[PDB]
Amino acid sequence: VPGSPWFGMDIGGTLVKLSYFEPIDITAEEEQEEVESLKSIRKYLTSNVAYGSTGIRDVHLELKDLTLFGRRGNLHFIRFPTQDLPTFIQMGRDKNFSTVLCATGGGAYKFEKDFRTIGNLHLHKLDELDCLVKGLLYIDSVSFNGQAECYYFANASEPERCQKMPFNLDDPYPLLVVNIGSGVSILAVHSKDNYKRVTGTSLGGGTFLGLCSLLTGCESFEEALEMASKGDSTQADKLVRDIYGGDYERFGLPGWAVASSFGNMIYKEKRESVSKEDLARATLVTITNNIGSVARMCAVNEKINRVVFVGNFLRVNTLSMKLLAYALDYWSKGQLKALFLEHEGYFGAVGALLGLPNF
Template sequence: MGRQIDLSGAEIRADPGDGSPPIFLPRQPAASPLLALDIGGTLIKLVYTASCGGEEELRFAKFERRRLDDCFDFVRAQGLLGCNGTTTGSSKENMTLKATGGGSYKFGDDFRQKLGVSLDKLDEMDSVVSGANFLLQNVPGAAFTHMSGKRNSIDISPDNLFPYLLVNIGSGVSILKVTGNRKFERVTGTHIGGGTMFGLAKLLTGCKSYDEFLQLSQKGDNFVLDLVVKDICGELACQKQGLSTSTLASSFGKVITSMKKLADYKPEDLASALLSAFTYNIAQISFLVASLLGLRRVFFGGSYIRGHKSTMDNISYALDFWSESQMQASFLQHEGYLGALGALMSYGDPRDENLNLEESQEENSHEAAGPTDVTSADEHNDSNIFPYLLVNIGSGVSMIEVSQHTAFILFIICALALLSAKNNLVR
């Protein structure tokens, strides 16, 4: 069995607002460094051990995937290949690094040719969940809320952690129900995530990096392009119906009636509108999934967030709004490194000895229950159409559960409207 990491007493000593500060491991014996990687669709994330003032700590680094050679140079410069990982012999060519993410397959040969190491490929979702559980169970202050610009640390007892919903936002979005250590179900996900947003941002604003896009969005005003309820109903009608005049009705909706061309819009306003559109949408999907599963605790992770205040505020506001304050969005200090953290934790774990990706998937497959047919006999009867879900797609999208009772009310309203119109014609 390989080296294990002693997590007892782990703590963050730096200002919690400083991005991804080191995590000190005061009881970890000094030894050669360990390195694990998460090679995603956009970024390469690294977590590694290093010595600082006689103590061991976890450090974090990331590179754009297109800058793979820069990552190799960093690994060499930091001396992260010195007896790192596990070996099957005495030569460096037999050295193995723990890695997860789809890129661990695509770039396995590059690591072998450029660094002389093999990649032990771990299941991505298993690594993400292990990384999240490590932070939540071992690092005080790793979880926090962020609402209206205010950050508050939250302490969660390991005895009261499960179950929870983990929304991991990277190039795409994965939503997982976590019920224990290495016990989870990938409930659903969407391909419309950070990769989609940044791709559109590059086309619309010309920004060259995701961080540049986030900085642009901070300076912009999304309401230059976004349609709000007041724009549709007018301020007086909003007051009569008890609606907030600033409630977002349609992202980019004002563009439909505008004579402006793309060049007439400021890049920062376009960036702000993109960020709010994607963030609110992901938060609403998360709310719907949490509601279906009966979960109130929702953690958000992934490199999409990056500690960006507006992103966290938007997610928190949306989840609070849709749940009527019954759910609270929580975030993680090292949200972009969950997969790499989980991969690092697998060093010396006897459960990971000789455990390949296929076996890992089989181990967790019993957690993923298949869809259940809960349709009643009445619903199978074609003559009974109620209840059903009405999805009304206009400038925005409304979803309405229609029962026989609500349909009758709608029929009466429509009949009265037709009668009124007929009377007006007679006059």
């Protein structure tokens, strides 16, 4: 492995994710041979938790004293909007920084020519879903600083008992991976080298954020979630009891289940009384439950009972995680389990970093 900072980057449709390995076993002689630009990069990344106006280091996710490529170091996790990649690349071309970059996600292709404006930088494009699988399996194998990387919600159908609990993935196959980013990819993983994309859905995190922005005027993902936490989705949705006056008993649909998402918004007087918060929550519930349903159908067809949900639609989004856990547990009568991972949307970036020794 190369004199070069060790990065892996996943350039998605909405967010760039960057994994950075900071060596902590640097010898006295190594510090001598280190050029100023390399020292400047290391100090900038490790002494700041906000980069410019939109970059964020997720300090709580840092893996400390990881051994990687024969060196000990800390693995850092950084995100910024893809819209701001021109600023990243303009920073990279700065004279104070004159690298082998393993990059994945669609932007590895879309912005290939832009990365090559950085003199002599060597860009290696790696497949988006292969990096996801490799990074997910790697992070679970090294643990989250000794704690479990994977968790589930115990007793997900009872709120008085529902609680996050660690889950052991030491024999993780087979596994359904549901990656909720701008859109959704669903993978059936049979071994480390044997997986297929079962299907996907374009109703993903970008549908939640785009519809929420149109309907409520929210200006950020976090604001959308804050609104949804205060709302009542039943003010927008038409429920089974709104159609039947009760349960649809013959087919086991309870009266409180949604029959038609946003279905009460066909009435003008209801549109005039619904709140922005109600609409935010209805958008979240609609998108989340649709993903849960698709995930359930894929698990049944693939004969897989463990479904891991990743991607940044679920970052700081406990409501959606609990909705997913409840829906899988309820519809399957306990035979399917929703699983979640602490490192959220960073697995592609880690998987890309792991491709470095091949170059």
